[PDB]
Each structure stands twice: as structure tokens, then as C-alpha cells.
Specification:
CATH topology: Leucine Aminopeptidase, subunit E, domain 1
Bound molecules: the ligand CCc1c[nH]c2ncnc(N3CCC[C@@H](S(C)(=O)=O)C3)c12
Oligomer: monomer
CATH superfamily: Leucine Aminopeptidase, subunit E, domain 1
Number of domains: 1
Shape: globular
Largest sheet: 4 strands, mixed
Radius of gyration: 15 Å
CATH class: Alpha Beta
Length: about 170
């Protein structure tokens, strides 16, 4: 049993809810919240901008030190950093950005990072300002992630379309 509430069950291990991932993280305080990161951990907009804002920029400060030491992530890769006031840990995952021409096949590699964590609160990778089709992102999620994932979809219209079209 866990504290996640109001989710629709899609499969054995994937759950979905119309919710602001920032508000959901603040209420649940999960072991892992996933950030929709870029390779530079520059959290300017989308989910990343919102999560970083909610940490009062502490996520960005920590991220800049990480990059200065380690260099950029790979598209499809991830790193574990602090969850600050939102979660125990933040898993920063880099899905492909279609608006940069990155290979959509890398979306599966991105979701594979979730399998290193038993339970996660997350957004749909590569959706929103990353430019991919969110229906496709949900399909890859379901077909790749085997651990327990609680997806937060900000847009109500989108949440309804994802549910109504889910096979
Ligand atoms: C600021 C956006 C946002 C705020 N809060 C959210 N909660 C869940 N999903 C979100 N997405 C919705 C838009 C696109 C995706 S994207 C590609 O940036 O990952 C982010 C958001």
C-alpha cells in the first residue's frame, strides 16, 4: 500500500491522474520524483521549470554543480539528485526533444531509467515542450517500465484523451 490517491489504473504497474506534478509531489513526498530534464540540467520551462521554481532554485544550484563536475547527460540518460522539498530524490531523465531533431527511439531508453526505482512519481517523457506525441509516450511507458509508476498529466483535456484512447 502507498499514499498515492485518485489515480486510474492502466496496467498492473502504471497509474495515471490529471494533476500538477509539483502539487502532487508536495503532497505525497515520494521517494522519487522524475524531472523532464535536458542534458545540461537547465531547468527553464515545462515540468523542469516548474519543479525547479518550487525548490526556490535550489534544484538549479545543485544541478549546476553536478554539470560542472560531470559534464552533460546523454539523451536517454539520467542522474539521481536531491528531491529538495519535493521528494527524497529527483531522477532527472532526458527524453528526446523532437524540437531539437532527436531520435524518438531514444524514448524507450529514457523510460528504462525508471526500472532502477521501485516506485516513482513522473510526467510523460518527451511530452509538452519536448514535442513528442503524449499518446505515444504513454504507450512506451507502459511497454518499458516494469516498476510502479504514478503519472501526473497537467492538462485535463490531455488526460481525458490519453485515458479514452488507451489500449
Ligand atoms: C510547465 C509544464 C508543466 C507544469 N506542470 C506540469 N505537470 C505535469 N506535466 C507538465 N507538462 C505539460 C507540458 C509539456 C510537458 S514537458 C514536455 O515539459 O515535460 C510538461 C507540467
Amino acid at each position: 500500500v502507498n499514499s498515492f490517491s485518485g489515480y486510474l489504473k492502466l496496467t498492473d504497474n502504471v497509474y495515471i491522474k490529471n494533476a500538477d506534478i509539483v502539487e502532487e509531489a508536495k503532497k505525497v513526498k515520494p521517494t522519487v520524483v522524475v524531472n523532464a530534464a535536458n542534458v545540461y540540467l537547465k531547468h527553464g520551462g515545462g515540468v523542469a521549470g516548474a519543479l525547479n521554481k518550487a525548490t526556490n532554485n535550489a534544484m538549479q544550484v545543485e544541478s549546476d554543480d553536478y554539470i560542472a563536475t560531470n559534464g552533460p547527460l546523454k539523451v536517454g540518460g539520467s542522474c539521481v539528485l536531491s528531491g529538495h522539498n519535493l521528494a527524497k530524490h529527483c531522477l532527472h531523465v532526458v527524453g528526446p526533444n523532437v524540437n531539437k531533431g532527436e531520435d524518438i527511439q531514444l524514448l524507450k531508453s529514457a523510460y528504462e531509467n525508471f526500472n532502477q526505482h521501485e516506485v516513482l512519481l513522473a510526467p510523460l517523457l518527451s511530452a509538452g515542450i519536448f514535442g513528442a506525441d503524449p499518446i505515444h509516450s504513454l504507450r512506451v511507458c507502459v511497454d518499458t517500465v516494469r516498476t510502479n509508476v504514478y503519472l501526473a498529466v497537467f492538462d485535463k483535456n490531455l488526460y481525458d484523451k490519453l485515458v479514452s484512447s488507451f489500449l
